[PDB]
Amino acid sequence: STPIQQLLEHFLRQLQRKDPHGFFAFPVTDAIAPGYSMIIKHPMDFGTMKDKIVANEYKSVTEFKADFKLMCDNAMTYNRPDTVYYKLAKKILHAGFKMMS
Ligand SMILES: CN1CCc2c(cccc2Nc2cnn(C)c(=O)c2Cl)C1
Numbered sequence: 340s341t342p343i344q345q346l347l348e349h350f351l352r353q354l355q356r357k358d359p360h361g362f363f364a365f366p367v368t369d370a371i372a373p374g375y376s377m378i379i380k381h382p383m384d385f386g387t388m389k390d391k392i393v394a395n396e397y398k399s400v401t402e403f404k405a406d407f408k409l410m411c412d413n414a415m416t417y418n419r420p421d422t423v424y425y426k427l428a429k430k431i432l433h434a435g436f437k438m439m440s
């Protein structure tokens with residue numbers, strides 16, 4: 340594991356601690372979220388992010404942060420402002436970015 344891989348594994352562990360229900364742990368299915376794949380062009384989740392780290396698909400912290408933001412943006416797009424996923428996505432976006440400086 341390269342230095343970037345190690346740093347990103349650290350960040351991912353800390354980010355996932357902010358999602359204790361694991362709402363962002365795995366891809367959203369259309370079964371749980373009707374029409375999701377039609378509304379969200381580029382899905383993302385922490386599990387996919389983990390696989391990308393292990394496959395050495397991130398070459399910068401900027402790339403990793405963009406996937407994190409994509410995941411949060413997707414939750415803020417499909418879900419309405421009032422809602423649990425929207426609020427958590429917005430919360431962890433800000434805290435996570437701060438955490439990753
Ligand atoms: C395997 N996981 C997939 C994701 C998930 C599960 C359970 C409860 C909430 C979620 N996460 C959702 C679900 N629906 N929507 C619309 C979302 O935006 C998220 Cl993050 C089961």
Ligand SMILES: CN1CCc2c(cccc2Nc2cnn(C)c(=O)c2Cl)C1
Pocket residue numbers: 346400438439440
């Ligand atoms: C004193 N701080 C320095 C920063 C830091 C610490 C611990 C865990 C992650 C970080 N943050 C990093 C580390 N390395 N790189 C390359 C970064 O870009 C960031 Cl934000 C301890």
